[PDB]
Amino acid sequence: METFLFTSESVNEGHPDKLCDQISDAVLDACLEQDPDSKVACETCTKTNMVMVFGEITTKATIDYEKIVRDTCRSIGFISDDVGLDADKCKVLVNIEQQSPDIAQGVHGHFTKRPEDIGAGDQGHMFGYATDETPELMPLSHVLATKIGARLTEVRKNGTCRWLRPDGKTQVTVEYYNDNGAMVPVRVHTVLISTQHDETVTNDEIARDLKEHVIKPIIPEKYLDDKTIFHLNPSGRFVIGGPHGDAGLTGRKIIIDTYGGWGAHGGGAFSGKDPTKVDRSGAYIVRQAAKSVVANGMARRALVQVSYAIGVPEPLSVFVDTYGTGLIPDKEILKIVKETFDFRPGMMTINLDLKRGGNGRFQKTAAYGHFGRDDPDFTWEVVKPLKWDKPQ
Amino acid sequence: METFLFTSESVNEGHPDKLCDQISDAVLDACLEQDPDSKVACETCTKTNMVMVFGEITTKATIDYEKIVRDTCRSIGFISDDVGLDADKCKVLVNIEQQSPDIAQGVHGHFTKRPEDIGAGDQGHMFGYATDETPELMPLSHVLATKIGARLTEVRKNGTCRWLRPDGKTQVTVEYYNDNGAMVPVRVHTVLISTQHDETVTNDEIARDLKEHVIKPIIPEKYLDDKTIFHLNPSGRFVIGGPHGDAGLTGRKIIIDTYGGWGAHGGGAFSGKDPTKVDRSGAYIVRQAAKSVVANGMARRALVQVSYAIGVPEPLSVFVDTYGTGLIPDKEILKIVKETFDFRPGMMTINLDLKRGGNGRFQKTAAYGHFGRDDPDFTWEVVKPLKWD
Numbered sequence: 179m180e181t182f183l184f185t186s187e188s189v190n191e192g193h194p195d196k197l198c199d200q201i202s203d204a205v206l207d208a209c210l211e212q213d214p215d216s217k218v219a220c221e222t223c224t225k226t227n228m229v230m231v232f233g234e235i236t237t238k239a240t241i242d243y244e245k246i247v248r249d250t251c252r253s254i255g256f257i258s259d260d261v262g263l264d265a266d267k268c269k270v271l272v273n274i275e276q277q278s279p280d281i282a283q284g285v286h287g288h289f290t291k292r293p294e295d296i297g298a299g300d301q302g303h304m305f306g307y308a309t310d311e312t313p314e315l316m317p318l319s320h321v322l323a324t325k326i327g328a329r330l331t332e333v334r335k336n337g338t339c340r341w342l343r344p345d346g347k348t349q350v351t352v353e354y355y356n357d358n359g360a361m362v363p364v365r366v367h368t369v370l371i372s373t374q375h376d377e378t379v380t381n382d383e384i385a386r387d388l389k390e391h392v393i394k395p396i397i398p399e400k401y402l403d404d405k406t407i408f409h410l411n412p413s414g415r416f417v418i419g420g421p422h423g424d425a426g427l428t429g430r431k432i433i434i435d436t437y438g439g440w441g442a443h444g445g446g447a448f449s450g451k452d453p454t455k456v457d458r459s460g461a462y463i464v465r466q467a468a469k470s471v472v473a474n475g476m477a478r479r480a481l482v483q484v485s486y487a488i489g490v491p492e493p494l495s496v497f498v499d500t501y502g503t504g505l506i507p508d509k510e511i512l513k514i515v516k517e518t519f520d521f522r523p524g525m526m527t528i529n530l531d532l533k534r535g536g537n538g539r540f541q542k543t544a545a546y547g548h549f550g551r552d553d554p555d556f557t558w559e560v561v562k563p564l565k566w567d568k569p570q
Numbered sequence: 571m572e573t574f575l576f577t578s579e580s581v582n583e584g585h586p587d588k589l590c591d592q593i594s595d596a597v598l599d600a601c602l603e604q605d606p607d608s609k610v611a612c613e614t615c616t617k618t619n620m621v622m623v624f625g626e627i628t629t630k631a632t633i634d635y636e637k638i639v640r641d642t643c644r645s646i647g648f649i650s651d652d653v654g655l656d657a658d659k660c661k662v663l664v665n666i667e668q669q670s671p672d673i674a675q676g677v678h679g680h681f682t683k684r685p686e687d688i689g690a691g692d693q694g695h696m697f698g699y700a701t702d703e704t705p706e707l708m709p710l711s712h713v714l715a716t717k718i719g720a721r722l723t724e725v726r727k728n729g730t731c732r733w734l735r736p737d738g739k740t741q742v743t744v745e746y747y748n749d750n751g752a753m754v755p756v757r758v759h760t761v762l763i764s765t766q767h768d769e770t771v772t773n774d775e776i777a778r779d780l781k782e783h784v785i786k787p788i789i790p791e792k793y794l795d796d797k798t799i800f801h802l803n804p805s806g807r808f809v810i811g812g813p814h815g816d817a818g819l820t821g822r823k824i825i826i827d828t829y830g831g832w833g834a835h836g837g838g839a840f841s842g843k844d845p846t847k848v849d850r851s852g853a854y855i856v857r858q859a860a861k862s863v864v865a866n867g868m869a870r871r872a873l874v875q876v877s878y879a880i881g882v883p884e885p886l887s888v889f890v891d892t893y894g895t896g897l898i899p900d901k902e903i904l905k906i907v908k909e910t911f912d913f914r915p916g917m918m919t920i921n922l923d924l925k926r927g928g929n930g931r932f933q934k935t936a937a938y939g940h941f942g943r944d945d946p947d948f949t950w951e952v953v954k955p956l957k958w959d
């Protein structure tokens with residue numbers, strides 16, 4: 179049986195880049211809760227004892243940027259210089275201005291353009307992907323790395339591993355077989371975790387606890403064997419973490435946000451962006467398309483690209499590829515996708531309910547990936563029925 | 571003839587995200603020039619009247635961060651509030667500290683580990699890609715978007731289009747034919763440019779000038795026809811730009827830095843990173859491997875993944891896929907790539923000469939893409955001979 183090794187990583191919510199995504203999306207949530215028509219382009223960065231929120235917001239909302247920043251950091255567990263950032267000591271810089279009027283006239287006519295006439299908030303390209311290899315129609319390498327990172331957070335919060343600190347990363351190498359273009363996981367080859375820790379725990383205790391409390395409960399037993407490789411805190415010490423160890427920025431985890439290196443990426447970040455930014459609304463809709471093609475049994479795997487021009491409602495290009503797993507030709511799947519899905523940003527916003535913030539609607543997307551989640555707020559995970567001649 | 575549409579974009583050196591990449595790599599260059607063993611992790615961000623350099627540097631170098639920032643902005647053409655940032659008046663913030671000692675012990679033993687023992691400076695995965703569809707073994711959608719963006723900067727600087735301002739973007743949609751897994755460009759479907767401009771030029775003049783001075787000189791005539799679509803400054807006004815129009819950050823153009831959506835990306839940014847950061851040295855080596863497989867005639871297309879753990883010299887995984895274009899099996903190409911290439915970071919650094927800064931060695935990688943360039947400083951663009959039958 180010929181196989182190959184494919185690797186995906188993740189980080190948890192205490193990773194300093196993920197912190198920035200969550201602050202950017204906490205700001206988006208706060209704007210939309212008061213003004214659903216908010217134009218939001220909120221970037222965040224962090225380093226030792228410093229968070230800065232910067233970029234462009236036009237909102238009728240009254241927003242306390244400082245509070246949102248400190249509250250977000252506090253909830254993730256950045257509550258002392260000892261764990262790499264103190265939410266209640268750190269400098270909070272704010273360099274927020276209104277959206278460029280040159281952008282605003284072209285995109286939405288300063289909040290006068292009707293939904294079907296709203297232009298793309300910028301140019302770019304976006305991909306959606308789905309694979310039948312997991313029930314959430316996501317790649318197993320990604321899913322396993324992601325769920326391990328979430329389990330790492332959970333055993334700190336639930337008091338199972340009292341020695342953990344917020345900042346952690348994971349990486350899973352899966353051995354795969356190609357079944358007529360479909361991806362069939364064989365076994366997990368290598369599992370890696372690097373997690374921040376206090377000074378009370380030995381490397382033997384870290385290794386024991388990570389294997390028993392974190393990795394074993396998440397990876398299906400059928401994928402683990404006596405030859406599976408384990409790298410557990412390979413640096414040998416990870417006491418210094420969060421912004422103290424490593425500068426964070428919004429949009430530096432776009433592959434961890436998406437498909438772990440499977441499918442494709444157009445390069446646009448998600449977090450801190452209102453849905454006129456097709457970086458977000460476009461990627462969500464082409465995930466809905468890719469997932470719908472696979473969930474309807476039209477294909478075992480699907481990749482969809484869309485592209486846009488700033489100020490133009492209609493996409494410049496659309497493609498569908500099923501890696502030869504389609505039960506009808508890709509040209510016919512492309513025709514069905516284009517008849518079923520409205521790629522116009524004004525339409526995507528309403529059709530996926532993307533102007534709703536609050537109850538951390540977008541903050542939830544900013545850690546543990548945007549795709550393959552079952553929370554009803556993830557509206558682009560809802561499968562659309564597709565009209566086709568489905569085999570008996 | 572059955573075809574499909576594939577789109578790639580670019581931005582030029584005046585795009586605020588690309589400005590950040592160039593500042594981050596200007597800081598790397600400046601450190602390496604004095605201290606080749608500099609540990610550099612320099613992030614940059616920018617918004618109206620403000621640039622900030624932040625992250626971690628351990629260097630024996632004496633560095634003027636403010637001068638490097640202002641010189642980099644000045645050279646790109648950010649010389650007034652009128653064109654979106656004033657290199658001589660903007661606030662320059664600096665939050666640079668030394669590398670975490672916890673990282674330093676694990677990666678390089680505080681500058682004591684020998685090359686073969688240097689660990690990956692972090693975990694992660696990187697892909698390299700090559701395609702025989704262009705002489706540079708890069709995807710045509712990416713190459714055309716990139717070369718159009720570079721021509722856009724050129725006609726501003728050389729005084730061909732004097733209305734231009736530094737900040738511009740491109741996108742090209744190519745109609746492709748699949749030839750048994752190989753990619754064969756048929757024609758250019760859609761060309762888009764959005765460029766910053768002064769108040770002295772009409773939208774009709776912009777469209778005329780961009781077609782005649784920027785697009786026509788770059789796109790091969792064989793790819794352009796009467797049905798090619800043009801979007802030329804479709805927003806209708808792009809007077810405000812650079813940091814004034816839009817916040818920039820290092821590492822927010824990783825697809826424009828690489829293959830324009832072709833192949834794959836592991837998510838690691840390049841700019842501001844010394845070569846112990848396998849995000850950079852790992853991506854460079856797997857581009858060299860993918861390109862070498864294609865240039866040796868082993869395949870018409872090649873994707874190579876490598877992955878690492880922090881502190882471990884040897885990669886955790888390697889894969890080769892030729893999209894069914896391989897003339898020998900992918901398992902055998904993987905065996906030749908692993909016998910030919912040394913993926914240990916301490917060895918990659920020396921083998922690609924990545925500790926040399928100066929004459930903007932890394933600053934030049936920080937706009938117009940890291941791959942498919944002819945400049946001899948792009949050491950990873952050198953084809954290695956591969957032994958096969």
Ligand SMILES: Nc1ncnc2c1ncn2[C@@H]1O[C@H](COP(=O)(O)CP(=O)(O)OP(=O)(O)O)[C@@H](O)[C@H]1O
Binds near residue numbers: 302445447807811
């Ligand atoms: N008035 C205008 N009309 C058209 N384009 C404009 C414009 N003002 C600015 N732009 C361009 O649009 C660019 C934005 O590109 P991106 O950086 O791709 C946006 P982003 O939302 O930060 O997404 P990213 O995640 O891809 O960085 C600006 O930096 C500039 O080149």
Ligand SMILES: Nc1ncnc2c1ncn2[C@@H]1O[C@H](COP(=O)(O)CP(=O)(O)OP(=O)(O)O)[C@@H](O)[C@H]1O
Binds near residue numbers: 416431
């Ligand atoms: N001592 C240590 N041992 C192991 N891991 C550590 C560590 N100190 C920090 N790390 C982890 O390594 C992370 C670095 O993750 P990344 O953000 O991927 C690095 P980067 O150079 O910024 O690349 P990027 O482009 O992927 O963002 C830190 O944020 C932290 O989680």
Ligand code: MET
Binds near residue numbers: 218219816
């Ligand atoms: C076209 S620049 C990208 C969007 C811009 N940041 C805004 O505020 O809408």
Ligand code: MET
Binds near residue numbers: 625626673
């Ligand atoms: C493992 S954290 C990423 C690297 C870090 N910025 C450094 O200073 O080396």
Ligand SMILES: [K+]
Binds near residue numbers: 424425426611613
């Ligand atoms: K960093």
Ligand SMILES: [K+]
Binds near residue numbers: 219221233816817818
């Ligand atoms: K931005």
Ligand SMILES: [Mg+2]
Binds near residue numbers: 195425426427430
């Ligand atoms: Mg990072």
Ligand SMILES: [Mg+2]
């Ligand atoms: Mg106060």
Ligand SMILES: [Mg+2]
Binds near residue numbers: 300301445457
């Ligand atoms: Mg973009």
Ligand SMILES: [Mg+2]
Binds near residue numbers: 818
């Ligand atoms: Mg940007």
Ligand SMILES: [Mg+2]
Binds near residue numbers: 692693694837838849
């Ligand atoms: Mg990384």
